[PDB]
Amino acid sequence: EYVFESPKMKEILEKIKKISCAECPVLITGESGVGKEVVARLIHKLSDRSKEPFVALNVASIPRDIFEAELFGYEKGAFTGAVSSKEGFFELADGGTLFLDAIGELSLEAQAKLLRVIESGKFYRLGGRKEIEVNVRILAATNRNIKELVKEGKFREDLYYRLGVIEIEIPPLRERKEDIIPLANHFLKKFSRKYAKEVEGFTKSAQELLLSYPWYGNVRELKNVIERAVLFSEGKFIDRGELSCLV
Amino acid sequence: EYVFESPKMKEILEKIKKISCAECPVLITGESGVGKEVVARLIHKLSDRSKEPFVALNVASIPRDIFEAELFGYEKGAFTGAVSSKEGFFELADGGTLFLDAIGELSLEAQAKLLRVIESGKFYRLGGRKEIEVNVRILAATNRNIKELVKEGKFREDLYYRLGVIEIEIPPLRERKEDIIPLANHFLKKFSRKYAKEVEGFTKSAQELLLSYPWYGNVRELKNVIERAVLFSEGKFIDRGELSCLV
Amino acid sequence: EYVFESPKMKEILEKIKKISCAECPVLITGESGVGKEVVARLIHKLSDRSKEPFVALNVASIPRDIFEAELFGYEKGAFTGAVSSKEGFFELADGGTLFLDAIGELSLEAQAKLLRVIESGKFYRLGGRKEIEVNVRILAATNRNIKELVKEGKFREDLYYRLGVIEIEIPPLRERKEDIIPLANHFLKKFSRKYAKEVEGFTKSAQELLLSYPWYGNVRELKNVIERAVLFSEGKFIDRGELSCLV
Amino acid sequence: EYVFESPKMKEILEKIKKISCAECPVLITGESGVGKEVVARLIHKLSDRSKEPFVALNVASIPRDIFEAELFGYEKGAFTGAVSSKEGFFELADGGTLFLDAIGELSLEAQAKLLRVIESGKFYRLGGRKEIEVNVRILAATNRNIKELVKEGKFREDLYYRLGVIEIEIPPLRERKEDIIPLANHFLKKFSRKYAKEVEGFTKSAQELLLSYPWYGNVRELKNVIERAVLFSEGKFIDRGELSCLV
Amino acid sequence: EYVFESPKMKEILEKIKKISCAECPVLITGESGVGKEVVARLIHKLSDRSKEPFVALNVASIPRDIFEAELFGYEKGAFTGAVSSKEGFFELADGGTLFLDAIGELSLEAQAKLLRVIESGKFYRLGGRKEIEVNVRILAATNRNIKELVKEGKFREDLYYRLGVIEIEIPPLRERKEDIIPLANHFLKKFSRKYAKEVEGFTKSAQELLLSYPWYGNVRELKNVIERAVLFSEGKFIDRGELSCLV
Amino acid sequence: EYVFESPKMKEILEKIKKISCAECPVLITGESGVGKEVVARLIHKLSDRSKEPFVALNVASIPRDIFEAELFGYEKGAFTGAVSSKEGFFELADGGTLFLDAIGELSLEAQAKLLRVIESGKFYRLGGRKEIEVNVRILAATNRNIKELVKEGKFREDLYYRLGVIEIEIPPLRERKEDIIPLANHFLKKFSRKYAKEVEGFTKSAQELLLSYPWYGNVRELKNVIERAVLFSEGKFIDRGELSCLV
Amino acid sequence: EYVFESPKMKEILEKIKKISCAECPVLITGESGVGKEVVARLIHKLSDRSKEPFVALNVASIPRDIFEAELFGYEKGAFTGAVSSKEGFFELADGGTLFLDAIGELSLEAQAKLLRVIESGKFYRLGGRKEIEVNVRILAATNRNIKELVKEGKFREDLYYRLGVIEIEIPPLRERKEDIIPLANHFLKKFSRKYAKEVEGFTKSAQELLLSYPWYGNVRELKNVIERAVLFSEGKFIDRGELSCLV
Numbered sequence A, B, C, D, E, F, G: 001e002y003v004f005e006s007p008k009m010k011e012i013l014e015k016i017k018k019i020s021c022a023e024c025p026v027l028i029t030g031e032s033g034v035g036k037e038v039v040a041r042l043i044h045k046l047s048d049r050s051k052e053p054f055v056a057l058n059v060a061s062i063p064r065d066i067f068e069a070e071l072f073g074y075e076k077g078a079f080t081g082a083v084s085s086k087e088g089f090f091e092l093a094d095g096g097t098l099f100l101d102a103i104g105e106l107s108l109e110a111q112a113k114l115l116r117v118i119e120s121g122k123f124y125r126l127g128g129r130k131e132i133e134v135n136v137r138i139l140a141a142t143n144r145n146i147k148e149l150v151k152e153g154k155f156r157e158d159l160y161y162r163l164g165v166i167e168i169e170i171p172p173l174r175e176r177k178e179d180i181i182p183l184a185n186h187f188l189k190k191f192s193r194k195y196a197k198e199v200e201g202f203t204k205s206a207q208e209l210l211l212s213y214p215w216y217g218n219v220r221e222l223k224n225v226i227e228r229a230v231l232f233s234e235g236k237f238i239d240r241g242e243l244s245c246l247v
């Protein structure tokens, strides 16, 4: 039930299928709403770990003072407010997939702490003296210009080459015009069913509008606009007027 | 007992009715006193959750160091040394409605923490390793210029497109002149009853004054001025003089 | 035993009487010593809560890290604080009157925390998950130029319209010259009795002095000057010389 | 055994006597060593509380984080640490006299915390919910230019009018030349006795020196110089030479 | 299964062999992806400690407040949060090899704490009063310009002469063109086997491309590009086109 | 066994003797090595407390957060490491002598805390509510220009006049040339005995050198130079050559 | 097995012998690698304490908040000072030698804390009220320009004259050319034995190189270069070529 029609999206879909047999890190980039999370979850579903956990994590929103504790866990003992050991998210995802979302907003301090784990699967728990080993497939996404961040020294070169073994750059909706109408149709069908309405399609006038609008919020903005059009619709068809007052 | 008379307010009232069957996030904006909270509680009352809790929260006033704990709760254990787990507000609102007030004053740090929850309904408790899932309808309001905040990078683009699926921008009272007199009348009736007074209406002169005053505090300022007029009134009618010394 | 003689003070006294039947927030402003606390306590005495507690609070002097704890209390559990729950000042004033003094010096951070309570009477305790409801009549006073603070963004517009439902702006003594002599006389009587002296009144020369002095400390400065004059007095009358060396 | 000979010191002594029957706050100012503490303790001795405690406190040297605890005490509970309640200095001085020394060096933050207590005698303990009432006579002293501090906003106007009900401004020794010789004589007698020496007085030459020296340390500097002259003296008289090498 | 073909790499391999009998510190430098960790682990495998532990540590990512505790351990007692003593990483590596990675990013404060240990093998535990002695072979790597850091005072001269007894500076891939094709071939073989593909080699056109590309991520970037080429490949050979759209 | 030969040192020695019967504060100043501690301990030995404790304290090196605790002690309660009360140094020196070394380097914050104790001998323990009284003779020294510090406001005028009742300003060695040779001789005798050497005196040439050298470290530098000369000496006499290579 | 051949090194060796009978502080300075630690341990071995402990301490690398605790220890009680008392390093070295390394990097705050101990051997434990006395011989070393630090006020004059009773300034290798060849020979012998190689000496060409190279890392750099030359050597002799590619 996902839409891939434009040339680039079709290529992307192909790459996703071709890496099914692999477990190497994938770095997914693009503007807000272009479908990075959809692609990450799809890569997971088509992979050899489809039946293992998919642990999602906004890695930049974790406060700096608990970063290690949260990713690597901590050992019962001195570096403590605690009685017993606690698994971090790397262990929680052992044998599965760990999705580092907002990777490009991570602090330099935190990027450095992630460095050795990505390739070796090994780390010490906060306060522990036993190397722990996990087998985790890494996915990462960001809507930041990550190549620019590397150039400006805001993102570590050595972490970039570890994460971006496979690189999927999803283009903005406005450069995938072939996706627009099929996407709009897909949502119109979904919402019309969901809200028990009699909308069926768009006038030719409305379709022109959909194709010329920039979609700064990309697929998510499109989905929102169709969800509005359906809820406020009267006819069997959505006309240019109904859209124009929604964008 | 709410007043909607001007064209825009009537449209707004219609949108409110048309989204009764839906559960999508609503983003309510406008100057102080224009009725954002009234609109939020109305949306609730007309919705499929009217009978479930309506949890209000000034989300920007929560101190940064307890933000997660308060929204997501915390697990008994070593991240802070409490004894037992505690529900956050998302859980407390499960099956109901969560109203994020002052959303536009939220810090960038805190906006990022809210990001994944809005669409997936999933999060980890502070210190926990079990994904929790809730089904919460989100409403948000702010008297800040939220589109400008996005342009200036003071508010995340990706959070904006998640929150503003339905957008209700309530205009200032001074651009809804058709509401002014019915509002004043509504308050005059309410307070005259409440304080056992004999006031019945306004002179034609007073009404002109009400229509030309800017109402920088909008509906709330209007309500205050009428409450004063009634308490200090003598006649059966409020004349321009009694108002002029109140504004 | 309070003096209200000038036109404006007489109007103010009237407003105070006319709001006896009401419970709406009153915002009292004016220079140091003009009688803001007298007015606040008078409003209380003439109100329907005269027999309930009158909780005074310099709200701006509460340190920021305990603001919530102090106003809203805290739940047992809930952050290192403690074994058991503790009422905040809002609860302590339930059914009574809560006087927020120095309201205009409150920090922006703290103003925002007060926002929802003023109109809804509802809040959560620090660390609690049960909405608490109280019925508190709010009075507030400040010697700061609060309208200017709003214009400069130093004080929230939305809190100002919540607090200033009724607005009493008490003028400086120097613009209430009709109050000066009756005030001086009132104090002369009070202190002459208190310190067992034989002073009875002021010469005509002294009275001129009292009327032309600016009284930058207003009623309080006046009261101090008379208290001095009585303690250091010899005659049955206070002459210009005895005052001139006191101002 | 205190010396008051110059006109201003004689006036001051009179004011002290005339306020014996009173309990109003006294604000004592002047350069270092002019006798502020002597005046404060004298006011106490001649007052109706001569037999009650005289609690001295360098109020500006109390660290900001314990200011409330120290002045107002704290209730058991009160954010852990303590088991039981503790009286502050206001309570310790109940029925007595509380001498706030270095009042002019107090931080703005701390001045504000003292505000309501001065006139109402009421306050809450840190963490407490019971208003406490005490009956304390306040004295305050500073060697700072307190009127300038008010003008520059470094000292609150509203606290100044509360403290300075009676104002005693003690002049520097260099503007009280009539006090110099009697003071020097008084110390000469005191130390000559104390150190078993045969000094009796000063030559006419030495006296001229004493009168022309600025005395930047005021009475204290004078006392120090005489204490030196006596210890190092040989004759029955102190000559200009013995002084000149001491100043 | 490691590739050393270019002149400099062959020299480096020789040095590695010639130091097998030694235990002196080795300082390995070069751009990201040039093989510093491979060289460090190789030195270990060929050394007299091949069978002892190889403890890897990103020494610059350890937070400053726990640096000592982590390297030197801590004694049970004060400087606490603890009940019992804990070995640091120096002890954990006793008799083995300790690999200080990112040595050039270490803070000056931390560099100073490492100083005496490097040559003497002796240190006190945090809070301990017994000198501990260990026999640890030190390796260190960094992708920072470490000679420049010394010149700029960002890295201690005295630590530099302690660490760089043997200095291996690994050149970028772009200055080891003799390594490029054998490396590409090595990876092609490895991945073709791993992903069960029929790729065997590169066209002459592809090989030209590989030799002229800068390889800013060095061997790691090369390995990534080959891994892509194999996963997306169709033929038995990879042509220039398949590479060009990968670089 | 102390040397006082120059005119000023002889005067100083006389002052010391003349104050034996007194207990007033002495403020001792001068460059590093001129003998401030020698003078302080001498004043003690010749005083009426020679047999009571001499408590030395580098008062400026005490960290600010424990200043009160260390000088005034703390009451059980307060709530830190504590179960029981602890004497501060003022109490430990009760009946004895308290030597405040480096007084000129004390922070303004700390100077203020010392203020009331110096003359009244009274203070409260940290956290205590009982005034404690001690009888302590105060000595103070510093190598800072204390009169300049007062002028620049870096040192309180009111503390200066309390400390400097008796003032001993010890001149640099270079302005006490009469002391140089006897001092050198005194050390030569001391060290020659101590290290079993045959040195007896200095050549005329060496003595000229000793008299013309500035002695920036004053008596201590001189003592060091003689200690070297004796240890490295061969003859019965130290010649100019042996000194010249030591200065 | 230490080499002292040049004139200055021979003088230094002599001073070391001549101070065997003494216990006075020695201040050892010079560039990195010139042998300061060798000289300090030699002074110890030849001294009357050769058989007592030699406690080495990088005094500048101790964190400021534990400086006292570490040097002077702490008393049980004493701010959750743990349960029991703990000796500091001064006590641990009682009767022995305490070597303060990196003395010139010590903070002004910390230098002041060391001041009184150096000459009096007396101090209080953190939190203690019993003067402790120890008999410790002090050695100190630094590679910082300590005389310049005194002039710039970065190092206390009064501590400098306490530490530098005996001053050994070890010159750079480049100003001790007579030491170079014997040093190189000494190392060649040592390493040739250690690594079972057949190297015996240097060609005349190599020796010229050794003498003209600046040796910025001094004896340590030389030792490193010889250790490399021996490990990578083939002949019985090291020629200029083998060195030139090593420097």
Ligand SMILES: Nc1ncnc2c1ncn2[C@@H]1O[C@H](COP(=O)(O)OP(=O)(O)OP(=O)(O)O)[C@@H](O)[C@H]1O
Binding pocket: A001, A002, A003, A004, A030, A031, A032, A033, A034, A035, A036, A037, A038, A039, A142, A143, A219, A220, A223, B158
């Ligand atoms: N190809 C697609 N077909 C159908 N639905 C899609 C497609 N791409 C995106 N969507 C929908 O659009 C919305 C945004 O997708 P997604 O959450 O993956 O965006 P994103 O690029 O991760 O955005 P952000 O940067 O804001 O996190 C989701 O509702 C997703 O289900």
Ligand SMILES: Nc1ncnc2c1ncn2[C@@H]1O[C@H](COP(=O)(O)OP(=O)(O)OP(=O)(O)O)[C@@H](O)[C@H]1O
Binding pocket: B001, B002, B003, B004, B030, B031, B032, B033, B034, B035, B036, B037, B038, B039, B142, B143, B219, B220, B223, C158
């Ligand atoms: N349409 C309406 N009819 C009657 N009363 C109204 C209406 N809109 C608002 N009010 C009244 O005006 C007051 C302010 O409205 P509300 O609190 O909803 O404003 P707001 O936009 O949330 O303002 P703020 O941003 O300052 O919180 C309330 O007392 C509300 O009951």
Ligand SMILES: Nc1ncnc2c1ncn2[C@@H]1O[C@H](COP(=O)(O)OP(=O)(O)OP(=O)(O)O)[C@@H](O)[C@H]1O
Binding pocket: C001, C002, C003, C004, C030, C031, C032, C033, C034, C035, C036, C037, C038, C039, C142, C143, C219, C220, C223, D158
């Ligand atoms: N109208 C009045 N009649 C008699 N006494 C008065 C009057 N107004 C004020 N006073 C006396 O003057 C003094 C100051 O009054 P009050 O403390 O209420 O002033 P305020 O405006 O609250 O001052 P501040 O801003 O300094 O807190 C008090 O002693 C009060 O009792």
Ligand SMILES: Nc1ncnc2c1ncn2[C@@H]1O[C@H](COP(=O)(O)OP(=O)(O)OP(=O)(O)O)[C@@H](O)[C@H]1O
Binding pocket: D001, D002, D003, D004, D030, D031, D032, D033, D034, D035, D036, D037, D038, D039, D142, D143, D219, D220, D223, F158
């Ligand atoms: N009128 C007086 N007669 C006799 N002795 C006096 C007189 N005034 C002051 N002294 C003595 O001179 C000294 C001045 O002390 P006092 O503490 O009263 O001055 P102060 O103004 O409080 O100084 P500071 O600002 O330094 O605290 C004291 O020793 C006091 O006993």
Ligand SMILES: Nc1ncnc2c1ncn2[C@@H]1O[C@H](COP(=O)(O)OP(=O)(O)OP(=O)(O)O)[C@@H](O)[C@H]1O
Binding pocket: A158, E001, E002, E003, E004, E030, E031, E032, E033, E034, E035, E036, E037, E038, E039, E142, E143, E219, E220, E223
């Ligand atoms: N000579 C070689 N032969 C085969 N594979 C190599 C060689 N050198 C490096 N690699 C491979 O390429 C990558 C080189 O990474 P390595 O960690 O050794 O580089 P690095 O310089 O330490 O990188 P960084 O500075 O980014 O940590 C690893 O996958 C390694 O396996």
Ligand SMILES: Nc1ncnc2c1ncn2[C@@H]1O[C@H](COP(=O)(O)OP(=O)(O)OP(=O)(O)O)[C@@H](O)[C@H]1O
Binding pocket: F001, F002, F003, F004, F030, F031, F032, F033, F034, F035, F036, F037, F038, F039, F142, F143, F219, F220, F223, G158
């Ligand atoms: N008059 C003297 N006769 C003999 N020895 C002296 C004399 N004065 C000082 N010394 C010696 O010189 C050394 C330094 O003197 P002291 O420690 O008292 O100086 P200081 O002024 O306190 O120096 P700093 O400012 O460095 O503390 C001591 O060893 C002391 O014994």
Ligand SMILES: Nc1ncnc2c1ncn2[C@@H]1O[C@H](COP(=O)(O)OP(=O)(O)OP(=O)(O)O)[C@@H](O)[C@H]1O
Binding pocket: E158, G001, G002, G003, G004, G030, G031, G032, G033, G034, G035, G036, G037, G038, G039, G142, G143, G219, G220, G223
């Ligand atoms: N005279 C000597 N004979 C033989 N070896 C020496 C000599 N001097 C120094 N070395 C060797 O040179 C190396 C550095 O010496 P040392 O550590 O004492 O120098 P340092 O001045 O303390 O250096 P840093 O300032 O870097 O601490 C050591 O291995 C030492 O053994």
Ligand SMILES: [Mg+2]
Binding pocket: A036, A037, A101, A141
């Ligand atoms: Mg996403």
Ligand SMILES: [Mg+2]
Binding pocket: B036, B037, B101, B141
């Ligand atoms: Mg609202």
Ligand SMILES: [Mg+2]
Binding pocket: C036, C037, C101
């Ligand atoms: Mg007031």
Ligand SMILES: [Mg+2]
Binding pocket: D036, D037, D101, D141
């Ligand atoms: Mg005083």
Ligand SMILES: [Mg+2]
Binding pocket: E036, E037, E101
């Ligand atoms: Mg590496």
Ligand SMILES: [Mg+2]
Binding pocket: F036, F037, F101, F141
């Ligand atoms: Mg000293």
Ligand SMILES: [Mg+2]
Binding pocket: G036, G037, G101, G141
């Ligand atoms: Mg060293």
